[PDB]
Amino acid sequence: LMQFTLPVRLCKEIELFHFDIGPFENMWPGIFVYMVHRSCGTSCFELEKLCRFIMSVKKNYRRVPYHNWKHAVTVAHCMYAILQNNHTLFTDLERKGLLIACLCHDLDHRGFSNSYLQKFDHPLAALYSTSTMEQHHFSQTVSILQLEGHNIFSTLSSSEYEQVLEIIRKAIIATDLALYFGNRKQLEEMYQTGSLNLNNQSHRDRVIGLMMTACDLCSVTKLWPVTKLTANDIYAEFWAEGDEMKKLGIQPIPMMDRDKKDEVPQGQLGFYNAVAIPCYTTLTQILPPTEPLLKACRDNLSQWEKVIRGEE
Numbered sequence: 001l002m003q004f005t006l007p008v009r010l011c012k013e014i015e016l017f018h019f020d021i022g023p024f025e026n027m028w029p030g031i032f033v034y035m036v037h038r039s040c041g042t043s044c045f046e047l048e049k050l051c052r053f054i055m056s057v058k059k060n061y062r063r064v065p066y067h068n069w070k071h072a073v074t075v076a077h078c079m080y081a082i083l084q085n086n087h088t089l090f091t092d093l094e095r096k097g098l099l100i101a102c103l104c105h106d107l108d109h110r111g112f113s114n115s116y117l118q119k120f121d122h123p124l125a126a127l128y129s130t131s132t133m134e135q136h137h138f139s140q141t142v143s144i145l146q147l148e149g150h151n152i153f154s155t156l157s158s159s160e161y162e163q164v165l166e167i168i169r170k171a172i173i174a175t176d177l178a179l180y181f182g183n184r185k186q187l188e189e190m191y192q193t194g195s196l197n198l199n200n201q202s203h204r205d206r207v208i209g210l211m212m213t214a215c216d217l218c219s220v221t222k223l224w225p226v227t228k229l230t231a232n233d234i235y236a237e238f239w240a241e242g243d244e245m246k247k248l249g250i251q252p253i254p255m256m257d258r259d260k261k262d263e264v265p266q267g268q269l270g271f272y273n274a275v276a277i278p279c280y281t282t283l284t285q286i287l288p289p290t291e292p293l294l295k296a297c298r299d300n301l302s303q304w305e306k307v308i309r310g311e312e
């Protein structure tokens, strides 16, 4: 039967947490199928259906600077790394559902925060009061699944199918970084009071929620030049939103004000300290083999420290 193989350098490096999917868009689909076949099996999905789902998911990402197809596949590779290093902790359905959740997790992103839809009074802010974009992303995922020839889950039973869509729904919602802070706090307390229970379904949920934040943030766990250059796309969106904020007569937060360009290094410090380091710290406690993500995050925090001290 028909597996995907990759060239030698990609065959070795794709297993590492710090892998970069590269600038060749035409390989990203095959990189994703490669990752489902190894993390899940060549029997998880019909190849015709999967390839068609992948191309329709791609079609529905927008040509925005950060929240694009490249991001989607990048976020799926980091999930793949996590699943392959924690082999026997995850159910057959979780392995199926999570790489799809990652591919689909920013579907039809416009390059604007939930907060900018709320202040623009975009229609989606009326349909979805909280996690506005994240609820749109799940909805968009469900649409693509109902297209002729795209039900990659067709072989699953009714309640197996309901389970995988519920996994995908929670996983996508959890990428609402406003929900991360409380999710990690409850996880950190449960871990330390030793009462953390991977048989408790609402525990797995939180643990998948943190894995989702971790994959979403993985720009910070890359080789430094990847991290430095992804940072430029992240701010290009934010500052465009800042411009849109000013058009409505609202001063954007500092994060989104392009007049405060020069303070970026300090903004990244706050972010690694307030957000990224705690995420990989907690996730490494809960899943020991994910340590390399925490190590690489630490490394990149030290690189931003060097930028402020004018050593870089």
Ligand SMILES: Cc1ncc(C)n2nc(CCc3nc(N4CC[C@H](C)C4)nn3C)nc12
Pocket: 177, 217, 219, 220, 231, 234, 254, 255, 256, 260, 263, 264, 265, 266, 267, 268, 270, 271
């Ligand atoms: C790397 C990465 N990954 C994911 C996300 C969501 N983010 N968000 C940022 C923004 C970081 C930030 N910058 C600022 N500064 C800019 C200077 C201004 C004074 C305020 N404040 N904050 C908190 N970086 C990332």
Ligand SMILES: [Mg+2]
Pocket: 105, 106, 133, 175, 176
């Ligand atoms: Mg998102």
Ligand SMILES: [Zn+2]
Pocket: 071, 075, 105, 106, 175, 216
């Ligand atoms: Zn994302």
